[PDB]
Symmetry: C2
Subunit: 322 residues, 2 copies
């Protein structure tokens, strides 16, 4: 159209990164994403206290130990936000399984089926859902199993290293969400270069590289850049399959109207010099370890989400067991 | 009275951390330790160029590609330093398998058997050798397998988290070498404190905790504190089974003669409050990830050693193939 946002929609499928579904439709996204940190934030908003009470009652109604109830309440809460979001958009929503299961393959699978079940009980088809999993080797294997054995589509997140990107591709997962701004954060905090040209942004380069690898070798996994610090990073990735953006940045993209030029494409990726590689667990863990930023961000990413999960549990138990 | 070193020898078995075996006997250690880093340093010393030429001659004979001949040369070089060290001491020497195999369980095992073989060809019994392995889950499993299936004794190194310490204990490895000063380095660089009291030193606390857990629950694995920044850390660990110290600090302990008080003791540990826990891979990786310092130091520790290995290979190929 004319705004940067509408222009971006010509080259990339825009996705809204938030749990605050009231602010969604203003940007008309295709899909939506949520994570432990977003649900937490939104769950504390006055406007959504109604969903929380319903989730609590669900816990209460299913009964069992208090743990069965906080788990089921939280699981339902996620599903509730999910369903509401779905009424506002035409595509899929991403619901993440607890980060504390990041290294437990079977737990992530079982928990994923559980979420898909809860959604099913609410009349929502799994085709509208993307289960978010931490991109650890086990999370990726959980993704593989979910896709191949249960037809459950996944959103591999907290993806930082090229190794992770590769393992996900071979695992044939539906979608990956490479974090861009957090890569910038690491380079800003550790290296001595605190600034980057949109195109030089480390995060943008990781996603650009991953995108070229995926397209050049015909992997059907969807590349969705995520977590952004500015709109320059977003514009430098125009052309990417998908880009999940925060309401704040979506709003900025809706405000300005400079000419937006596509940057990523199947033709440029085909001209890049990347060579195909195969990774078993050993090679994966090694190649991943060689990427310090990735090792440290994936690790801290898991702790932060887990913490958001712990904080959400606490407030809820305090709320339903005084 | 006596020197701090000789006093420490009453409560702890002293081990020399170095490849420079000429400076060893001055401190009369029980065991000795070496690593891909120390060997690198060692081989570049004029005094040991004789061992390098012998190692080179060995590798050319086995043949293969440049990388191959370089492998046998390096393997022999390690063994040669090992043998020389053994002539100077009554105990065991630690030889580490390439850090680049840290995530490859079967490679570490095969490579370990190989080193034990080379030593055997040199008339050295395996009872005199401790194969050093990175303390990753696979390295620990390699240790377990080596001990149980081949009677090969291991030195689990780059041990930082309590999880690692636990996994090693259940794996029944012969010895673990918890790094002390590198834990200090992490806390100095990341937290905002510059100096701690010997007893408050994070590194000292990690080893103290590990020691109490081992003794309290009767694990026979030997606890050997390693990598020290100062002698205060060493004195705060007096009583530990073993302590491998650099020639520099050994020299300082030999110069001062203040009264040294034992700090760690199995009986004290046994009469303490710590709960026994079991860790499978899942629990291990999770408990380990909860320790940021450990996650980052183990990870960087592997990259650094691997780099020392890469540098040693290069210098050698340039020397035997130009």
């Amino acid at each position: 159209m004319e705004s940067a946002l509408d222009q971006l929609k010509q080259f990339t499928t825009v996705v809204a990164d938030t749990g605050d579904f009231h602010a969604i439709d203003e940007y008309k996204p295709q899909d939506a994403t949520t994570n432990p940190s977003l649900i937490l934030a939104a769950a504390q908003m006055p406007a959504y206290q109604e969903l929380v009470e319903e989730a609590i009652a669900y816990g209460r109604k299913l009964g069992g130990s208090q743990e069965d109830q906080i788990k089921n309440a939280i699981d339902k809460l996620f599903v509730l936000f999910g369903a509401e979001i779905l009424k506002k958009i035409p595509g899929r929503v991403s619901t993440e399984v607890d980060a504390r299961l990041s290294f437990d393959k079977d737990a992530m699978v079982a928990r994923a089926r559980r979420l898909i079940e809860l959604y099913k009980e609410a009349g929502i088809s799994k085709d509208r859902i993307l289960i978010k999993l931490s991109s650890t080797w086990e999370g990726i294997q959980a993704g593989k199993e979910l896709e191949e054995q249960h037809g459950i589509h996944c959103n591999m997140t907290l993806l930082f290293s090229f190794a992770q990107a590769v393992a996900c591709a071979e695992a044939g997962v539906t979608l990956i969400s490479p974090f861009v701004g957090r890569i910038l954060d690491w380079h800003v905090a550790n290296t001595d270069k605190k600034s980057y040209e949109p195109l030089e942004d480390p995060g943008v380069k990781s996603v650009t590289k991953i995108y070229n690898y995926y397209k050049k070798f015909s992997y059907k996994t969807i590349v969705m850049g995520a977590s952004f610090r500015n709109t320059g990073e977003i514009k430098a990735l125009a052309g990417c399959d998908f880009l999940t953006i925060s309401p704040k940045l979506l709003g900025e993209l809706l405000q300005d109207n400079a000419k937006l030029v596509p940057v990523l494409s199947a033709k440029a990726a085909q001209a890049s010099d990347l060579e195909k590689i195969h990774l078993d667990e050993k090679s994966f863990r090694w190649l991943h370890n060689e990427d310090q930023m990735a090792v440290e961000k994936l690790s801290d990413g898991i702790r932060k989400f887990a913490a958001d999960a712990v904080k959400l549990e606490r407030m809820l138990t305090e709320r339903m067991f005084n």
